[PDB]
């Protein structure tokens, strides 16, 4: 299963598997965020 | 589906006991090709006209014949050494002769990825290019330690009979080919 993440400075979609050194291509920044979910979320305007 | 290549034995090592005490001083004094230095080493080095042979004779009768190319050649060399010791004036005998180790060499005639080989057989191999250029493999069905080079040459050691080295090479050939 392709797990995708986002770099802290490049903001590029990088695919890495489990037990890998957290890194991003064309850079060396070590902050990797997770993309927002695709599931439907219901919010109340109250 | 044989490999088609046969190794060549370059050394045969065998220990043999004479069964009697020896006087290394007189042995070295009454011989021309005798090499012995008690302060340096306690064995007399005997060399003969066999194709290649070195005997490390000791005072307890134990002597190790090395450098031979076959078991029969090693036995002939050991018997010649025993005859020389007898002619030197000692009751030497030829008892307890058994092949202790044999070193052989072979070539596969194609390059081998040492990193791939160690990654595939780490539990049976060791690769440290910073120390020795050859990969050291230790197999059990062969009962043999092997030095494998990138050029395709493999040196095998730690066997007792030529059949062991032969089956060792036959088993390791497909692994290196694959």
């Amino acid at each position: 299963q392709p797990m995708i993440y986002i770099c802290g400075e490049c903001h590029t979609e990088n695919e890495i598997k489990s037990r890998d050194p957290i890194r991003c291509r064309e850079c060396g920044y070590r902050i990797m965020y997770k993309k927002r979910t695709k599931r439907l979320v219901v919010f109340d305007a109250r | 589906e044989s490999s088609g290549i046969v190794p060549q034995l370059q050394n045969i090592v065998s220990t043999v006991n004479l069964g009697c005490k020896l006087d290394l001083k007189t042995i070295a004094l009454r011989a021309r090709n005798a090499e012995y230095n008690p302060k340096r080493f306690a064995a007399v080095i005997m060399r003969i006209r066999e194709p290649r042979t070195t005997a490390l004779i000791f005072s307890s009768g134990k002597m190790v014949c090395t450098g031979a190319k076959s078991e029969e050649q090693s036995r002939l060399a050991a018997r010649k050494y025993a005859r020389v010791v007898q002619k030197l004036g000692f009751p030497a005998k030829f008892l307890d002769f058994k092949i202790q180790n044999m070193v052989g060499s072979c070539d596969v005639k194609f390059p081998i990825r040492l990193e791939g080989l160690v990654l595939t057989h780490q539990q049976f191999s060791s690769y440290e290019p910073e120390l020795f250029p050859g990969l050291i493999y230790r197999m059990i069905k062969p009962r043999i330690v092997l030095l494998i080079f990138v050029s395709g040459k493999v040196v095998l050691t730690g066997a007792k009979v030529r059949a062991e080295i032969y089956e060792a090479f036959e088993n390791i050939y497909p692994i290196l080919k694959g």
């Binding site: - | 021309r32 090709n33 005798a34 012995y36 060399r47 006209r49 290649r52």
Partner: protein, 111 residues
């Protein structure tokens, strides 16, 4: 106190260093006449390296052993012929030949 007896060395970079594995041996090669007289000494004595090193002051016993092993591994017929031929041990003429070899190497260094 050290009165400017030594000079500071700008070595041992704090970053990293590598290995050498080869320190001291650094042997010196032989020559044709030296090989001939070495074979003569072999025929005169045998394989005992102690006497050979004693009679060879300018060459090390370890180098002599290495040369003998190389000859045994490469030129076996020469060793067989050397063992076949025999010569009684000579001391005065051997010292004269040693002096001749010293003169020859001096001339080589001059060249």
């Amino acid at each position: 106190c050290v009165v400017e007896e030594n000079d500071p060395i700008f070595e041992r970079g704090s970053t990293t260093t590598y290995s050498s594995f080869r320190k001291n041996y650094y042997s010196k090669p032989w020559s044709n006449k030296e090989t001939d007289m070495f074979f003569l000494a072999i025929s005169m004595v045998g394989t005992d390296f102690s006497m050979i090193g004693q009679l060879f002051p300018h060459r090390a016993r370890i180098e002599i052993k290495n040369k003998f092993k190389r000859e045994e591994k490469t030129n076996g017929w020469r060793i067989d012929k050397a063992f076949q031929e025999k010569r009684p041990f000579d001391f005065d003429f051997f010292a004269h030949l040693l002096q001749k070899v010293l003169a020859e190497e001096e001339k080589r260094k001059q060249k």
